[PDB]
Design a protein around this motif. Structure first.
Motif, PDB file in Angstrom:
ATOM      1  N   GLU A   1     -31.093  12.681   0.575  1.00 15.91           N
ATOM      2  CA  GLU A   1     -30.466  11.364   1.310  1.00 15.91           C
ATOM      3  C   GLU A   1     -31.412  10.153   1.891  1.00 15.91           C
ATOM      4  O   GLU A   1     -31.046   9.103   2.023  1.00 15.91           O
ATOM      5  CB  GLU A   1     -29.330  11.741   2.270  1.00 15.91           C
ATOM      6  N   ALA A   2     -32.664  10.895   1.952  1.00 15.72           N
ATOM      7  CA  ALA A   2     -33.743   9.895   2.325  1.00 15.72           C
ATOM      8  C   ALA A   2     -33.988   8.990   1.095  1.00 15.72           C
ATOM      9  O   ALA A   2     -34.729   7.973   1.283  1.00 15.72           O
ATOM     10  CB  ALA A   2     -34.943  10.398   2.672  1.00 15.72           C
ATOM     11  N   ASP A   3     -33.765   9.524  -0.029  1.00 22.99           N
ATOM     12  CA  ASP A   3     -34.082   8.664  -1.656  1.00 22.99           C
ATOM     13  C   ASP A   3     -32.865   9.127  -2.558  1.00 22.99           C
ATOM     14  O   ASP A   3     -33.465   9.695  -3.494  1.00 22.99           O
ATOM     15  CB  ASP A   3     -35.436   8.777  -1.818  1.00 22.99           C
ATOM     16  N   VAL A   4     -31.700   8.604  -2.303  1.00 26.90           N
ATOM     17  CA  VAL A   4     -30.603   8.865  -3.290  1.00 26.90           C
ATOM     18  C   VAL A   4     -31.305   8.629  -4.683  1.00 26.90           C
ATOM     19  O   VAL A   4     -31.273   9.210  -5.651  1.00 26.90           O
ATOM     20  CB  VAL A   4     -29.331   8.620  -2.802  1.00 26.90           C
TER      21      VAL A   4
ATOM     22  N   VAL B   1     -27.222   7.247  -8.066  1.00 28.82           N
ATOM     23  CA  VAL B   1     -26.500   7.128  -6.751  1.00 28.82           C
ATOM     24  C   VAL B   1     -25.020   7.182  -6.667  1.00 28.82           C
ATOM     25  O   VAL B   1     -24.591   8.066  -5.937  1.00 28.82           O
ATOM     26  CB  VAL B   1     -26.741   5.671  -6.167  1.00 28.82           C
ATOM     27  N   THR B   2     -24.113   6.660  -7.676  1.00 27.58           N
ATOM     28  CA  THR B   2     -22.649   7.020  -7.866  1.00 27.58           C
ATOM     29  C   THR B   2     -22.482   8.761  -7.814  1.00 27.58           C
ATOM     30  O   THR B   2     -21.708   9.278  -7.115  1.00 27.58           O
ATOM     31  CB  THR B   2     -22.134   6.326  -8.803  1.00 27.58           C
ATOM     32  N   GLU B   3     -23.312   9.271  -8.873  1.00 25.19           N
ATOM     33  CA  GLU B   3     -23.277  10.689  -9.053  1.00 25.19           C
ATOM     34  C   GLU B   3     -23.392  11.465  -7.832  1.00 25.19           C
ATOM     35  O   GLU B   3     -22.804  12.576  -7.706  1.00 25.19           O
ATOM     36  CB  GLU B   3     -23.990  11.176 -10.229  1.00 25.19           C
ATOM     37  N   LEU B   4     -24.782  11.353  -7.221  1.00 23.08           N
ATOM     38  CA  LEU B   4     -25.251  11.880  -6.232  1.00 23.08           C
ATOM     39  C   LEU B   4     -24.347  12.057  -4.967  1.00 23.08           C
ATOM     40  O   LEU B   4     -24.391  12.712  -4.045  1.00 23.08           O
ATOM     41  CB  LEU B   4     -26.850  11.933  -5.842  1.00 23.08           C
ATOM     42  N   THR B   5     -23.990  10.670  -4.876  1.00 24.58           N
ATOM     43  CA  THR B   5     -22.947  10.453  -3.468  1.00 24.58           C
ATOM     44  C   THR B   5     -21.963  11.320  -3.536  1.00 24.58           C
ATOM     45  O   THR B   5     -21.428  11.845  -2.623  1.00 24.58           O
ATOM     46  CB  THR B   5     -22.761   8.930  -3.540  1.00 24.58           C
ATOM     47  N   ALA B   6     -21.121  11.381  -4.966  1.00 21.41           N
ATOM     48  CA  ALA B   6     -20.042  11.844  -5.017  1.00 21.41           C
ATOM     49  C   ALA B   6     -20.205  13.510  -4.700  1.00 21.41           C
ATOM     50  O   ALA B   6     -19.673  14.332  -4.214  1.00 21.41           O
ATOM     51  CB  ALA B   6     -19.357  11.951  -6.446  1.00 21.41           C
TER      52      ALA B   6
ATOM     53  N   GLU C   1     -31.725  -0.807 -13.569  1.00 23.84           N
ATOM     54  CA  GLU C   1     -30.950  -0.694 -12.210  1.00 23.84           C
ATOM     55  C   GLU C   1     -29.364  -0.227 -12.571  1.00 23.84           C
ATOM     56  O   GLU C   1     -28.949   0.463 -11.660  1.00 23.84           O
ATOM     57  CB  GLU C   1     -30.652  -2.252 -11.784  1.00 23.84           C
ATOM     58  N   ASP C   2     -28.983  -0.354 -13.857  1.00 21.86           N
ATOM     59  CA  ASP C   2     -28.123   0.318 -14.291  1.00 21.86           C
ATOM     60  C   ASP C   2     -27.930   1.881 -14.239  1.00 21.86           C
ATOM     61  O   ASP C   2     -26.930   2.396 -13.777  1.00 21.86           O
ATOM     62  CB  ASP C   2     -27.617  -0.016 -15.839  1.00 21.86           C
ATOM     63  N   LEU C   3     -28.779   2.506 -14.562  1.00 20.84           N
ATOM     64  CA  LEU C   3     -29.207   3.849 -14.572  1.00 20.84           C
ATOM     65  C   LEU C   3     -29.489   4.196 -13.047  1.00 20.84           C
ATOM     66  O   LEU C   3     -28.849   5.453 -12.800  1.00 20.84           O
ATOM     67  CB  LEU C   3     -30.300   4.391 -15.353  1.00 20.84           C
ATOM     68  N   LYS C   4     -30.073   3.617 -12.502  1.00 18.62           N
ATOM     69  CA  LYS C   4     -30.518   3.893 -11.068  1.00 18.62           C
ATOM     70  C   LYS C   4     -29.105   4.039 -10.226  1.00 18.62           C
ATOM     71  O   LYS C   4     -28.921   4.853  -9.472  1.00 18.62           O
ATOM     72  CB  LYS C   4     -31.451   2.860 -10.329  1.00 18.62           C
ATOM     73  N   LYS C   5     -28.251   2.884 -10.512  1.00 16.76           N
ATOM     74  CA  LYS C   5     -26.992   2.905  -9.714  1.00 16.76           C
ATOM     75  C   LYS C   5     -26.067   3.831 -10.044  1.00 16.76           C
ATOM     76  O   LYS C   5     -25.178   4.582  -9.516  1.00 16.76           O
ATOM     77  CB  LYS C   5     -26.409   1.479 -10.072  1.00 16.76           C
ATOM     78  N   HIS C   6     -26.058   4.140 -11.380  1.00 16.43           N
ATOM     79  CA  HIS C   6     -25.136   5.493 -11.960  1.00 16.43           C
ATOM     80  C   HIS C   6     -25.707   6.706 -10.977  1.00 16.43           C
ATOM     81  O   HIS C   6     -24.759   7.556 -10.660  1.00 16.43           O
ATOM     82  CB  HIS C   6     -25.543   5.496 -13.376  1.00 16.43           C
TER      83      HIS C   6
ATOM     84  N   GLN D   1     -32.920   9.201 -10.402  1.00 15.75           N
ATOM     85  CA  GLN D   1     -33.638   8.695 -11.532  1.00 15.75           C
ATOM     86  C   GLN D   1     -34.051  10.040 -12.298  1.00 15.75           C
ATOM     87  O   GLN D   1     -34.348  10.322 -13.147  1.00 15.75           O
ATOM     88  CB  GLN D   1     -34.583   7.943 -11.183  1.00 15.75           C
ATOM     89  N   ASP D   2     -34.932  10.780 -11.179  1.00 18.76           N
ATOM     90  CA  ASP D   2     -35.659  11.733 -11.735  1.00 18.76           C
ATOM     91  C   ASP D   2     -34.967  12.877 -12.190  1.00 18.76           C
ATOM     92  O   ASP D   2     -35.342  13.451 -13.195  1.00 18.76           O
ATOM     93  CB  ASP D   2     -36.645  12.563 -10.545  1.00 18.76           C
ATOM     94  N   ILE D   3     -33.371  13.280 -11.562  1.00 24.55           N
ATOM     95  CA  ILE D   3     -32.533  13.995 -12.105  1.00 24.55           C
ATOM     96  C   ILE D   3     -32.080  13.639 -13.574  1.00 24.55           C
ATOM     97  O   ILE D   3     -31.957  14.474 -14.514  1.00 24.55           O
ATOM     98  CB  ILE D   3     -31.375  14.061 -11.203  1.00 24.55           C
ATOM     99  N   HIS D   4     -31.950  12.462 -13.693  1.00 24.88           N
ATOM    100  CA  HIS D   4     -31.280  12.057 -15.063  1.00 24.88           C
ATOM    101  C   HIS D   4     -32.605  12.054 -16.389  1.00 24.88           C
ATOM    102  O   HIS D   4     -32.251  12.283 -17.336  1.00 24.88           O
ATOM    103  CB  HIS D   4     -31.026  10.756 -15.082  1.00 24.88           C
ATOM    104  N   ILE D   5     -33.750  11.717 -15.724  1.00 24.85           N
ATOM    105  CA  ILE D   5     -34.842  11.762 -16.806  1.00 24.85           C
ATOM    106  C   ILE D   5     -35.242  12.950 -17.161  1.00 24.85           C
ATOM    107  O   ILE D   5     -35.396  13.354 -18.214  1.00 24.85           O
ATOM    108  CB  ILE D   5     -35.919  11.070 -15.968  1.00 24.85           C
ATOM    109  N   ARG D   6     -34.988  14.152 -16.107  1.00 25.11           N
ATOM    110  CA  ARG D   6     -35.192  15.467 -16.660  1.00 25.11           C
ATOM    111  C   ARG D   6     -34.065  16.026 -17.344  1.00 25.11           C
ATOM    112  O   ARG D   6     -34.306  16.512 -18.457  1.00 25.11           O
ATOM    113  CB  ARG D   6     -35.238  16.164 -15.067  1.00 25.11           C
ATOM    114  N   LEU D   7     -32.864  15.858 -17.098  1.00 23.46           N
ATOM    115  CA  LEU D   7     -31.555  16.079 -17.801  1.00 23.46           C
ATOM    116  C   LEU D   7     -31.705  15.745 -19.389  1.00 23.46           C
ATOM    117  O   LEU D   7     -31.670  16.282 -20.317  1.00 23.46           O
ATOM    118  CB  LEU D   7     -30.376  15.491 -17.145  1.00 23.46           C
ATOM    119  N   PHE D   8     -32.024  14.303 -19.530  1.00 30.13           N
ATOM    120  CA  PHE D   8     -32.193  13.648 -20.721  1.00 30.13           C
ATOM    121  C   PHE D   8     -33.219  14.227 -21.654  1.00 30.13           C
ATOM    122  O   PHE D   8     -33.096  14.475 -22.700  1.00 30.13           O
ATOM    123  CB  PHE D   8     -32.149  12.203 -20.635  1.00 30.13           C
TER     124      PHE D   8
END
Ligand code: ZNH
Length: 153
Positions: A18-21, A66-71, A59-64, A26-33
Motif C-alpha cells: 500500500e506504500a506503492d499500489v 490499482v483497481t485490482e490490488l484495491t479490491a 496510465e490505462d494499465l497502471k490504473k487497472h 505494474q510489476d505484477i502485470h508485467i510478470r503475469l503477462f
C-alpha cells in the motif's frame, strides 16, 4: 482457514504493498503477462503495449493494477469474511471477463513473486505461507461462486 497470526503476516506485507499500489500493480502485470502470455489476451486495450517501458508508461494499465490490488486488499482485510466483497468480483469475472481459476493462480504466483522481489525482509517462509493460504482461500471461494453463476472455473 487461517490463524490470527497468519492474517497478521498477510496484512503486514499488504501495508507495504500500500506504500506503492500502482508500482506493485505494474510489476505484477508485467510478470503475469511475461510468464503466462495467454493472460494478455483478456486485455484488448493493452495489446499495443509491446515492451516493458510501454507497459510502465501506460496510465490505462497502471490504473487497472490499482483497481485490482484495491479490491484484493479489501478482501484480504476481511480475513476470510469476504462474501459481500467477493460476489461482485465473481459476477464480472465469471460472466463478463471469463477468467479461469488457472489465471487466478497465475496472478497469485505473480503477486507472490513481486512481494518477494520488493519485500524480502518482510516476506520470509511463514509470511509467504500465509499469503499463499490467503490467496488459496480467495480462489476457493471465487470458484464456488463461479459455479453458482454457471461458469465452470
Ligand atoms: C487478484 C486477482 C484479481 C482481482 C482482485 C481482480 C479485480 C478486478 C476489479 C476490481 C475489476 C474492475 C471491476 C470489474 O469486476 O469489472 C477488474 C476488471 C477486469 N479484470 Zn480482474 N481481478 C483479478 C484477476 C484478473 C486476471 C488474472 C485477469 C485476466 C488475466 C483479469 C481481467 C480483468 C479484465 C479484462 C477487466 C476489465 C478491465 C477493463 O475492461 O477496463 N482479472 N478486475
Amino acid at each position: 482457514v487461517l490463524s490470527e497470526g497468519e492474517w497478521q503476516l498477510v496484512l503486514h506485507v499488504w501495508a507495504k504493498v500500500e506504500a506503492d499500489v500502482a508500482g506493485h500493480g505494474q510489476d505484477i502485470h508485467i510478470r503475469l503477462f511475461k510468464s503466462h502470455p495467454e493472460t494478455l489476451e483478456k486485455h484488448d486495450r493493452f495489446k499495443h503495449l509491446k515492451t516493458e517501458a510501454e507497459m510502465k508508461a501506460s496510465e490505462d494499465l497502471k490504473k487497472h493494477g490499482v483497481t485490482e490490488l484495491t479490491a484484493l486488499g479489501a478482501i484480504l482485510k476481511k480475513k476470510g469474511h469476504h462474501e459481500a466483497e467477493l460476489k461482485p468480483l465473481a459476477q464480472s469475472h465469471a460472466t463478463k471477463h471469463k477468467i479461469p481459476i488457472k489465471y487466478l493462480e497465475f496472478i497469485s504466483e505473480a503477486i507472490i513473486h513481486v512481494l518477494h522481489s520488493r519485500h524480502p525482509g518482510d516476506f520470509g517462509a511463514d509470511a509467504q505461507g500465509a499469503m499463499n493460504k490467503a490467496l488459496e482461500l480467495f480462489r476457493k471461494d471465487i470458484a464456488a461462486k463461479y459455479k453458482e453463476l454457471g461458469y465452470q472455473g
